[PDB]
Amino acid sequence: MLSPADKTNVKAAWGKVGAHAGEYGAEALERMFLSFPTTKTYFPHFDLSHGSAQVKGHGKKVADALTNAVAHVDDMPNALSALSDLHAHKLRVDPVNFKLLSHCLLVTLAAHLPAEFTPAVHASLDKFLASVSTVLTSKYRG
């Protein structure tokens, strides 16, 4: 359950992220690759070094998908349907890895939004990313 206050908290934190969204998505990916190196095996055709244009470009895609979820928060299964097909059917992403990226997204937000990352907003963002992760793994066993 994303409560009304959760949706308000998530919209507000994302609003403050502003046009850094893509840079932040790229940073979250880099944190994941360094912190949880098992995740790098999904990107063998990527150069994952710092400053990589491929990680930067992909971080923008991740952020745009999250922004689509924020904008359609009451309808995320439909909004994310094509992406859940991709991650489950084509890429075979292990469900455990969505918890890893979700954590690295929270860390990135905390490192960039010192006023906004209150405990209440941390909780709301955590529920939001868990909801996104539930949709993206739902074509396995949901």
Partner: protein
């Protein structure tokens, strides 16, 4: 667990700047707020009804100080975490029956707190070193389940 010299450097340099009277309470409080089932183990702490009630609860702050002390004790013994945490493992595993997934959650919350406090200084390589630390502590605290 084995940290490289560069990892140990990143960890110890940041940790010397940590406020050890506050950061533990922040991490424990956020654990209780973000993962509410953990409140099951803290019924005696009193008012946990709202985030503000949790974060300003003096028992949460005092107990969080003890938790951070254990992390600090782990940092001094990175190459031998099992012996350091044996007593805490028997407590959390044999007596409390805390599921060990929650050790991982608290470690990750502490990482979020360090990122919040230190900002850009909490770089992705610094985070990666801390993830090895909190995983080693969580594994040591769980050793009595293994």
């Amino acid at each position: 667990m084995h940290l490289t010299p560069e990892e140990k450097s990143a960890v110890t340099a940041l940790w010397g700047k940590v406020n050890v009277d506050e950061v533990g309470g922040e991490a424990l409080g956020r654990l209780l707020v973000v993962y509410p089932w953990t409140q099951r183990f803290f019924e005696s702490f009193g008012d946990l009804s709202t985030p503000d009630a949790v974060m300003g609860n003096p028992k949460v702050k005092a107990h969080g100080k003890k938790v951070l002390g254990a992390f600090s004790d782990g940092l001094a013994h990175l190459d031998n975490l099992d012996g350091t945490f044996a007593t805490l493992s028997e407590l959390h595993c044999d007596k409390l029956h805390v599921d060990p997934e929650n050790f991982r959650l608290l470690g990750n919350v502490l990482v979020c707190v360090l990122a919040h406090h230190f900002g850009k200084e909490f770089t992705p390589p610094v985070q990666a070193a801390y993830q090895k630390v909190v995983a080693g502590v969580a594994n040591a605290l769980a050793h009595k389940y293994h």
